[PDB]
């Protein structure tokens, strides 16, 4: 029913994300100096790159009969790639949130992550952790030609615990820290002696609301699918639709670029692209 809407959202997200992801990586990696925040932004841009690399394949996957017509194709690799990309993007979002919560009360030294070596080791640790979570694909996934069409499908408590751990990693890590840091800074909750500008207020609210409306529906749908599974049936509940959650996920992954980096300093620089002397005086 909403497949046309989801396809339109996919196209809009791709069209608004490919140039936005392209511009940030080149600007940060060529013009601006390497700083820990800049490395966060560049890593998020790379995660968006590889995240949207399989998006054209996802067009065919979300095409007719919402199935995978590309046969076997060893789709473990690209499925693990996409899930690794989404995990890396949410982990970079939450580490950016933590670094921003450290940004307030700036003059302190705090945990001394300003050094580049610490930033690179943290980035590689995040990549390794996301590859550990994104590792298992062939353990459960298989393919069958059911209803005269082949699908990349996953294969009783193993699925339950897998979805549970995926949801708790995708909610407790990103969302709980966003509510601890962003929410208990913007609404005067927790220590609120730090004043906040109107632009800062609005942009934090936009970040939070976009993250919620884009990721909470997907996790909620996954939990609902896990709960209604192993009981009743599937064709009665009619879960053949709801790609809107993944569409919102792609929308968030393409919107975070333009929101985070394409503001303030970047806005004036993109739009564009005396010496003090002395004079006479009679006594």
């Amino acid at each position: 029913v909403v497949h046309w809407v989801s396809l339109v959202l996919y196209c809009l997200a791709f069209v608004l994300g490919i140039p936005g992801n392209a511009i940030v990586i080149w600007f940060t990696g060529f013009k601006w100096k390497k700083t820990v925040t800049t490395l966060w932004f560049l890593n998020l841009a790379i995660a968006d790159f590889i995240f949207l690399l399989f998006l054209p394949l996802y067009i065919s996957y979300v095409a007719m009969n919402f199935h995978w017509p590309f046969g076997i194709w060893l789709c473990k690799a690209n499925s693990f790639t996409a899930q690794l990309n989404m995990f890396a993007s949410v982990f970079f979002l939450t580490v950016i949130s933590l670094d921003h919560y450290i940004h307030l009360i700036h003059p302190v030294l705090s945990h001394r992550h300003r050094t580049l070596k610490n930033s690179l080791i943290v980035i590689i640790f995040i990549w390794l952790l996301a590859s550990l979570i994104g590792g298992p694909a062939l353990y459960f996934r298989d393919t069958v030609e059911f209803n005269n069409h082949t699908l990349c499908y996953n294969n009783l408590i193993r699925h339950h615990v897998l979805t549970w751990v995926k949801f708790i990693i995708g909610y407790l890590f990103p969302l709980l820290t966003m509510s601890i840091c962003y929410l208990c800074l913007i609404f005067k909750v927790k220590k609120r002696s730090i004043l906040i500008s109107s632009r800062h207020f609005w942009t934090i609210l936009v970040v939070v609301v976009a993250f919620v409306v884009c990721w909470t529906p997907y996790h909620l749908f996954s939990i609902w699918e896990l709960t209604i599974h192993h009981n009743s049936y599937s064709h009665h509940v009619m879960q053949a639709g709801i790609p809107l959650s993944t569409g919102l996920a792609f929308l968030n992954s393409c919107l975070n670029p333009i929101l985070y980096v394409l503001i303030s300093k970047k806005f004036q620089a993109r739009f564009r692209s005396c010496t003090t002397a002395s004079s006479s005086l009679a006594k």
Partner: peptide, 10 residues
């Protein structure tokens, strides 16, 4: 009851 499998990018 043929939901076994998935149709997302997870």
């Amino acid at each position: 009851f043929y939901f076994p499998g998935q149709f997302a990018f997870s």
